[PDB]
Amino acid sequence: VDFKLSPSQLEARRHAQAFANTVLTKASAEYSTQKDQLSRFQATRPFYREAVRHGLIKAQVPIPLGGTMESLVHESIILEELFAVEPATSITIVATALGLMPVILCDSPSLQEKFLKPFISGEGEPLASLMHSEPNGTANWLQKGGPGLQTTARKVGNEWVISGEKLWPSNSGGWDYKGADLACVVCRVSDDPSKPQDPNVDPATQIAVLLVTRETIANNKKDAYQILGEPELAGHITTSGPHTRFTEFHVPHENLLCTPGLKAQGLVETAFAMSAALVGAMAIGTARAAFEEALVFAKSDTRGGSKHIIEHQSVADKLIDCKIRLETSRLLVWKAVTTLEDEALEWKVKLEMAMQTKIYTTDVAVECVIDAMKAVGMKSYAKDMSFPRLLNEVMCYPLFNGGNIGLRRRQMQRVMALEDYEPWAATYGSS
């Protein structure tokens, strides 16, 4: 076993660090003045432009598919460096990666070649979005006997017709509310949308993913695709994840990602299991920023006494606790992405590892920031330090990309409950 980093992993970090300090630091001046989420998203566009120019969007796509992604560990290193400085724009890149994911993961070379083309080109500001989440919630989307997804699709002649709404999909409306360059819209197949899901059919068998571009939207009536709102978020205030409504929205059959059913469900699951592991690097960056600020304060400030506050056992204990959390978190992330990439392992082993990573890293990032604030004391509470930003940003992570309580713990529980569950298969091999 090995923990050493290669020259190009070391370079990937140097490059991501450089980008963060030279480019992303300048972003606050532009978005801090805007009146709302959308404007603050729009003021972010030139920084996403620079990220594309630096190859960061191209690096969200595997090498065999024309991108530059060297590995999932390189990816982890990049995300942590970025989120250590400024989640603005950084969150657009990662939201774009998710959106590309069902396409990256399908076994259809011609579909990939067409749809990933803008994203590997090294230019523009193309945006991808995985449109899964809904106003009514999705923790229970695969629950047999339940409502199911409220965005449905039916086949009409040689087209699919989407009806229903999405909420929260990052990047989905695009820069101008005329759409992301690529959106993957997860639908429940229903022939009469006003009929409840059949309580006797397994919900996973009814799942379709329909690709939807700016062109698809142009080719529809204006009212067929409405943005009804843009949530005002506690943190990550520069992202866009609108409330969209599809009313008799027409999509070409050739935009069906694969055959509706368990394969389509499996592509969503694998995309979201991969983000589950990666999202830990986001959490580590944010909490690393809280820890490093507090550490530098504690080593340079006596707080009106006769020694630096790091010499007080209780200040030390908090920073120790922060340190341990960050350390165990990065290890777990790296273990998990490395598990995901191992072709010898059963999916359920990869899935379980990814769930654990998401649950642990996200919950523990929150503790890390709060402890860092407690250690710095009253000064962490005013906006001339980073903490107020960090505090709101960190609380996203346990909630988002499938909430720990409703989704990730339930997915893990389900694997653990199977007869053939091998707890240590990712470590000690399969028995």
Place this chain on the structure above:
Amino acid sequence: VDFKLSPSQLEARRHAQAFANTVLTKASAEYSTQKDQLSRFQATRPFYREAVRHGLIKAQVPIPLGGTMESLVHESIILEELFAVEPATSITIVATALGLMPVILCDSPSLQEKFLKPFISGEGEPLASLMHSEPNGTANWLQKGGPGLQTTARKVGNEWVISGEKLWPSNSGGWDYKGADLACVVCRVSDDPSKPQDPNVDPATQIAVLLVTRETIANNKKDAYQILGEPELAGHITTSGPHTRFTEFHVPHENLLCTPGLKAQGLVETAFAMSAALVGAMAIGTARAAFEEALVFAKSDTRGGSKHIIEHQSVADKLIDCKIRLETSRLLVWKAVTTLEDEALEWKVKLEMAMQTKIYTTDVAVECVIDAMKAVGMKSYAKDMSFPRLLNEVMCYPLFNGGNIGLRRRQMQRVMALEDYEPWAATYGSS
């Protein structure tokens, strides 16, 4: 041992509820338009006027002194209800109450009579402020061999001169920066302000409190009292606790609160101990709002499944923990304030009890809000729910009114180390 609320206690609750619901619910429409801390604070003035009209500022002064304060339990119940709805204005009442505490507590009926006058009157918008906090910190203000406080007073004729800076004390500059109606100003006595605090005298013997009114500020040079800045706070965005420089600020010897030394220190200590216990009522209110919003949602939203989410064991567990935290917190506060009102108990017993309460209630209120958010899920992260505001507001409590790590734990630690410490004396009497 009895827990039953009196008719006067239930009236105070009803009364505080009616004020919060009819008056403080309107506050937000006003201050959300303003674009900085002071603008927001001033927009709060009409609601503080209303609070004086409802007699809330007068309810802060005991009966034997012309105010209507019935008991500390009444006060606990009042603060809980205000904070469960709106910390705007509510925070001003409490900051005013802290400001008046040292006057309320001193041996001197003529000073009590002259300075409390505008607060017991029922008219105007009088503000008070107890000015202890400094830019360099205060956790070590009483450390022997330390630099002590940096706000110092010297005796020059029939006057005291103040040199130094203050940060954070809420209300200190009044509505307009011409000063609070009654500021107490905790000072280190130094004949030569440019000489370091002598490392050989207990710092608690150099303490002096000087009463500074809007009049004193008018009877001084325009450059003798300056507001250097106003912190943009993470939460409690409508409060004012600015950066204040005293340069050659002249104060009448008659405005001296008591004898410099252990008595002056004891007065600051007794004031901050009372606020330590009462701060838990603010923290309970903020957390109670988080819990009840989460509870109402759990009991009425299925989150796209077949049953209300409270029916999920993991969701219920979160709410159970919130509930427990809130219940133990309230008991501890009521026990704390009762202990402070008992005249048979030594001071160290009331101190230790008050310290516990500040530490517990404020740490646990943060947990309660985060858990409530986790139980609600993604929805809790947008501003059509209260949680974003509550999260920011709740992170104030472990940090403010003497942070737990630096101040309250060491105050408690000092007491427990004393040779004659009786841990259970507030419960089973002294032996």
Place this chain on the structure above:
Amino acid sequence: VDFKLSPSQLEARRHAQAFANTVLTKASAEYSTQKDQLSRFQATRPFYREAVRHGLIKAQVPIPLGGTMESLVHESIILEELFAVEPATSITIVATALGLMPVILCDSPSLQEKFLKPFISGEGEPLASLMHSEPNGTANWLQKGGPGLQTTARKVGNEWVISGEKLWPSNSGGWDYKGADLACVVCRVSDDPSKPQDPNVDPATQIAVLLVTRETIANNKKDAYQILGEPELAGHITTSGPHTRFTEFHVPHENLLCTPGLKAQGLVETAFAMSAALVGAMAIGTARAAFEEALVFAKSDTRGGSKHIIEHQSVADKLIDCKIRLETSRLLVWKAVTTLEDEALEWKVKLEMAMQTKIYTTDVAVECVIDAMKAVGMKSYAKDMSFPRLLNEVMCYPLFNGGNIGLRRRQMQRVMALEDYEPWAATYGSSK
């Protein structure tokens, strides 16, 4: 709202401390030499005898029933003091109180006179036991469509016939495996125990509670009542809570506590709700022993340093955390028992408050002992300090008297899910 203790409350404390110090401290010399759980329990009998002679068994019964119990706060005070010193015997008093509770709680003056008599007499060592728990578990006993209690009862002639097994109930086989003086056996009614519980009958309608005395077991054939085993416990090593089998065991109709069904269930629930609140006083006692052993040590020992270890912030933070846990716990127990005594409040309100109390106090006591051990350091791991004993003892509380995970949180969850749930009813009263 008022926290002062009365002279009679201060007397209950003094009396219990004196009892614990002078009597209960001699018990270890006796039970430590014994080779198994039963022997350790038997070696405890002289100390239970002394408990009776000090009237501690009579203070488990209300005054209106000929007992000397003054209140539930008095009770809580007494239990903290006893558990702060030694849970041997102390556990037997409280097991007995639980076993007496269904009888104490019924509305049947003649049964009370009859069955409670030996416990109010100040004589002998009479044992009671609430026999509910079972080999297969009880967290799901009331689950519609589940198998339900495996101890069943059927009426034959003017008698009931008990079939099946209990496990865990303290005192249940009495001093000698010939039975507690009074056991309340919780059964599910069933005419043919070979048949599964009916999945369309609400389980709570099928509950029965049968009084089983030493007289009742003597009147049965030898193999109708058998002790099959005695669990060897991590802590509370001197308590007895055996594995009992009933095979065709005959009980007289006159010993049925009340009509089978919801009223039987309500009796069990009420008793376990009361014990839920009082179990917190037992947790408080154990943890307080830990906190105080550590506090003393921390202010007497420098651990080769120049200042007493209480003077290190990390050590203080532990003790501060222990103290906060003990103070908040005690407040909650007094709040809960006080709420339970409040006639103006609905059952749901009392139940919820008791569940919280059990959950909080028992979880947090564990933490309190572990932190105290961490504060003292390596020395806390050797049997010449109390900690090894306290750590095994404290882990019982979250698991026993209805575990927090399977039972108590489920009970509280269910109350919280009711449309008419008022969270602060016990503080601010009901909104109609």
Place this chain on the structure above:
Amino acid sequence: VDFKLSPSQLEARRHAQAFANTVLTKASAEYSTQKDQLSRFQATRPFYREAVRHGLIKAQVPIPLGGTMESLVHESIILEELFAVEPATSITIVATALGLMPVILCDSPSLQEKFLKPFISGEGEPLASLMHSEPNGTANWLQKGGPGLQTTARKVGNEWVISGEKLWPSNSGGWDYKGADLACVVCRVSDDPSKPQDPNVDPATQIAVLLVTRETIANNKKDAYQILGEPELAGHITTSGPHTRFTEFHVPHENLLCTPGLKAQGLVETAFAMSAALVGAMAIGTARAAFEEALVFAKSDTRGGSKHIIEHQSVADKLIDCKIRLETSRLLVWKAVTTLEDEALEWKVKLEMAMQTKIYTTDVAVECVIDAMKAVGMKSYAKDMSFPRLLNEVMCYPLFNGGNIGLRRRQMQRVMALEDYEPWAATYGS
């Protein structure tokens, strides 16, 4: 970066599992029958003899020194599997390993050849002990201004004379109270043993380590080495770790491990930093055993309901928390022992990683056993299940090998305060 185990790491696992199953499972029948720490310890001798015969004492010594230790990850793997079955004897192997460390780590080929020889032989049941801990405690043993260690040493001609008491060093008195085969006794230098440590000299500059054998004990007066007492322990009931008193105990100058001072302290510091990391494997072993037992139970028992209790979210949440604690702990331990083997990293980087690991893994292993018990419920409280044993064993770890509160957090805080502290040097290089 790589997580894959080599063929020989998987073989070391198989070998440790098989030995734990075929041999260690029979230990309890012997020691349970016994009445006190020592007799329980002595009842363990045949199982150590089998550990030696299986090559396990030899695998505690590096290959350059004639042992068979393949690497510190192999070691981590070996200990995890041992402690997941039975800590008895298992503990004796690691106490021995620690007691050999300062000889393994010194740079003195003649001391190494001489003192490591019994332990690489494959024969007997030789024991080693690192005798550092004392009745008055050791968290403050390096405190300038303090009393310092209370076992002192002074030079008399061409020998050293030891004066003081040790408490807790596992194995120290050997099997029969006539001493470990090798003990490394750590003393403070004091010409006058009744004189208080000079408050003006750095205590680290006065540390000495003296090698004591069964022969050094034999060559002394009967009453110069007294075993005063044997603590009865909450768990790990089969170890010996006596209260020992040296009164005028003569050691040949040649048995002095190195030059007194910073270097002797450094040998002790490195030995305990290595153990600080490996001690995490033990804690994983105990906690894994708890977790596996609770998992098997939850997947096959309905607790009188209609479904396996693992289908209840509250139960699954406990097992998810245990699983996470174990997974993070193992990753951390492997990161730490690897960090320690990296010649390119400075010591303070290695120290800090090791302290993190001891603190995290041992704290978290406790919560893991307790959460496993709570998921299982009442039945976990009785001795027909493993939990009562596992509960007492697991509380050893946050407290032993330098307790977290007094020793390991202070060693870590001290590193974090240095001007040159690089938090991420072990991950992102210097």
